[PDB]
Design a protein around this ligand. Structure first.
Ligand SMILES: [Mg+2]
Ligand SMILES: [Mg+2]
Ligand SMILES: [Mg+2]
Ligand SMILES: [Mg+2]
Ligand SMILES: [Mg+2]
Ligand SMILES: [Mg+2]
Lengths: 171, 205, 37, 142
RNA sequence: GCGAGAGCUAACUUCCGUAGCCGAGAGGGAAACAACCCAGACCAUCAGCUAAGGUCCCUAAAUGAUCGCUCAGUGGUUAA
RNA sequence: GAUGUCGGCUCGUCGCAUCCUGGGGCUGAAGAAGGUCCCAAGGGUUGGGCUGUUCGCCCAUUAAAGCGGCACGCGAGCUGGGUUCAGAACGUCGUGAGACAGUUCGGUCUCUAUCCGCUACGGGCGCAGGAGAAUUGAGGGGAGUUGCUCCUAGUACGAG
RNA sequence: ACCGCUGAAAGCAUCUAAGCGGGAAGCCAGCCCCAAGAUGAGUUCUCCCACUGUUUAUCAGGUAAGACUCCCGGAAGACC
């Protein structure tokens, strides 16, 4: 099951009607869910109650609770993905708000991020994707991962810093 | 979009640097702007232009009114151009540039009733190993009991030519403003002395 | 992808997860990938 | 012996399509168009009301709008003259979705065809008020 | 249809047995439709009740009542 | 009281269980070349020699030289080589007249389209006055193929 | 087809159960041509303008703007 919700300092859940709105210090992040299931603050912490116990209600339960915790941990501290480029000559740079990679292809790949999401590069062979919504950061990083998937023979490509890859090796 | 009306003059042979170029001469004469179509008034954006002059006697009362409103001179040819809103009264100078790719349109020369061999590039048949169907004649019009009909659209003998034809991406070889002329590389459709519609490349490369 | 009309359990790593009304299989080993269309 | 009619009346109705399941809405319109409660109650002629539909774009469809609801409309000699469109894809013509569901539940003869003149569909709310200089007696579905 | 042979426990197949219909049988139903389902037309009526079948609109009559199921348009193309 | 029968030609269109080209997954996928399965029917799918041949074999190319349906699609569209008329021959069978599992040479393919259908083209009337002209686009049709070379780069990869 | 993000049922895991992204010579649109008989017959500009006729001939008849007829021709065409 899914039941306890930790809500530190700047939390302001205004869950009126179907719009289960969450305002905080790290901008205003809204999240929509079912009205058939109950959700409100019980003094200090939060709780998401379910009515029926068949299966359709059970499935939406664990999902609704994780998503609110995600939106809570979001406006609290934030979300940040650490990506690592690998292979000879592979490198990334910054052109204003856009990320520019030079990863083996004849032309250089450019990625302009959507709203609320920010690109960052410490050393040119490392990418950092940071923003509000977990999904948008999840996607944007996956699009960067898509630019070059690590191959089964050398692992050349975009990987998750401390990511483990199995190596087939032919010749 | 940015277009004009002219007359096909002829074809000549011309050189640019060391290479010969077949050219179609177009007199893209001055075009009075006679009606401005606005979304506010007509429901779409366009310009009604005019072409060859008409003697005032030859012009009927309703057309006189239409011209007098814009205060022009009566024409004979009137065409619209969508999304082209110029100022003044339309001439090729500054409209077309030497080198610019254009879309020449006209009415093909009409060849009247033409049978399947000329009209559709058929094949006809044997000229000798026993025939009654010697060259032109289509073959089978259909199949058997099944679509006991003949396919709609079936390529057949009919009136060939005298249709609207647009020729895409033609080079603007030379321009002689004042002479109101424009040299175009290649062949524009229709006969000499015919109406032509030169415009911006429909979708350029 | 080995499109077998009879997808069965091969080893303790295959996870039978349905997709758009069809039986699909997601596993760690690339050869183990089984589908029905 | 049995009673026959007149025509001095031509009732105009204003049904709202908003959130009503398509066929469920359709039924109401087709019945009010033919002669449901019927003035003099006769079938040799049109006793029906002039239904005016509003909020066509906001109409409801169940499990599948994306899948299943496909409007097959096959053109001239079918030399692959087979055209099909999803109900979602009818964002082009919301008015033809209601129109070509209601005609589907109407008689099909000389008279039946005459009856599609009575239905007047619009996607808007305040903008349909075009054919709204005669009567505007609003009747809800159920 | 049921009971068998022949046939591939094929055929709108063939050859018997047995019942019913069509043949010679109109009317309702089964979209349409000899045979299936209901039912055997003496004539007239701008009367009434029912059968099989039905009661969202095309199309007569509950968009009926109650407790459930399925979410695949299954319903409204068969198996290991 | 007759639904002309093989092949060719002509003319097409359609299924996809896809020959090419497009997108993918797995590979005993290093790369390059493949294998195999999935999605996909938009277009494309060469010219000859032999045979009546369809088929098939060969020559020379190709991205590829797909398999099927449409009365083994199409003879009121053409051919008439094959088969199934009358002559004649050979082999064979029959005492014979004749005959075939055959083989061979020859052997008339019927000017006028009424309806539907199809291609073009007009006349009528409608579109709430009689007219000249410019038009929006609901809808519909056409089109849709592909190689090779260079650059990236002698880079990635590979011991080479 | 396929690859993925967020992610429960199943305290993990999962591209799915609710949601979201990407993805084909195919789909719709774009390109060229027809197209308001689109009887649902659309829009815009301009012109002419309210003529005459006894309850004995209940709408015909002069006319406007405009066109046709005829003639001479045509890179239009069988004829139109
Ligand atoms: Mg020839
Ligand atoms: Mg025939
Ligand atoms: Mg069984
Ligand atoms: Mg025969
Ligand atoms: Mg491939
Ligand atoms: Mg996309």
């Amino acid at each position: 099951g899914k039941q306890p919700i930790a809500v530190p300092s700047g939390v302001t859940v205004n869950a009126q009607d179907g719009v289960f709105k969450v305002k905080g210090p790290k901008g205003e992040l809204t999240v929509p869910y079912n009205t058939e299931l109950t959700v409100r603050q019980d003094g200090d912490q939060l709780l998401v109650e379910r009515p029926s116990d068949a299966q359709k209600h059970r499935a939406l339960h664990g999902l609704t609770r994780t998503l609110v915790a995600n939106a809570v941990k979001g406006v609290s501290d934030g979300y940040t993905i650490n990506l690592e480029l690998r292979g000879v000559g592979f490198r990334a740079k910054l052109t204003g708000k856009a990320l520019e990679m030079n990863i083996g292809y004849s032309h250089p790949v450019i990625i302009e991020p959507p709203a609320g999401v920010t690109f960052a590069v410490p050393e040119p062979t490392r990418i950092d994707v940071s923003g509000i919504d977990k999904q948008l950061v999840g996607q944007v990083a996956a699009n960067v991962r898509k630019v070059r998937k690590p191959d089964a023979y050398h692992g050349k490509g975009v990987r998750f810093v401390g990511e483990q890859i199995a190596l087939k090796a032919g010749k | 979009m940015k277009g004009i009306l002219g007359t096909k003059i002829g074809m000549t042979q011309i050189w640019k640097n060391d290479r010969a170029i077949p050219v179609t001469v177009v007199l893209a004469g001055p075009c009075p702007i006679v009606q401005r179509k606005t979304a506010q008034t007509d429901g779409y954006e366009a310009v009604q232009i005019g072409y060859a002059p008409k003697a005032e006697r030859k012009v009927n009362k309703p057309m006189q009114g239409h011209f007098a409103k814009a205060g022009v001179a009566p024409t004979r040819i009137l065409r619209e151009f969508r999304g082209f809103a110029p100022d003044g009264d339309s001439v090729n100078v500054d409209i077309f540039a030497e080198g610019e790719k254009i879309d020449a349109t006209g009415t093909s020369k009409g060849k009247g009733t033409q049978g399947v061999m000329k009209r559709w590039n058929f094949a006809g048949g044997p000229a000798s190993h026993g025939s009654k169907k010697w060259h032109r004649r289509p073959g089978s019009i259909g199949q058997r009991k099944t679509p006991g009909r003949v396919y709609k659209g079936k390529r057949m003998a009919g009136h060939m030519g005298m249709e609207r034809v647009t020729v895409q991406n033609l080079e603007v070889v030379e321009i002689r403003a004042g002479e109101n002329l424009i040299l175009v590389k290649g062949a524009i459709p229709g006969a000499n002395g015919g109406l032509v519609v030169l415009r911006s490349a429909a979708k350029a490369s | 992808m080995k499109v077998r009309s009879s997808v069965k359990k091969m080893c303790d790593n295959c996870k039978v997860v349905r997709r758009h009304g069809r039986v699909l299989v997601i596993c760690s080993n690339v050869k183990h990938k089984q589908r029905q269309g | 012996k049995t009673y026959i009619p007149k025509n001095d009346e031509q009732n105009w109705v204003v049904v709202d399509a908003s959130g009503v399941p398509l066929g469920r809405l359709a039924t109401l319109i087709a019945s009010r168009i033919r002669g449901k409660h019927r003035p003099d109650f006769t079938p040799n002629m049109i006793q029906g009301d002039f239904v005016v539909v509003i909020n066509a774009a906001q109409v409801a469809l169940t499990g599948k709008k994306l899948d299943d609801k496909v409007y097959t409309r096959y053109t001239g000699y079918q030399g692959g003259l087979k055209t099909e469109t999803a109900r979602e894809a009818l964002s082009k013509h919301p008015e033809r979705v209601i129109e070509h569901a209601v005609f589907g539940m109407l008689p099909k003869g000389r008279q039946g065809r005459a009856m599609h003149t009575r239905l007047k569909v619009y996607a808007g709310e305040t903008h349909p008020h075009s054919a709204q200089k005669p009567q505007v007696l609003k009747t809800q579905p159920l």
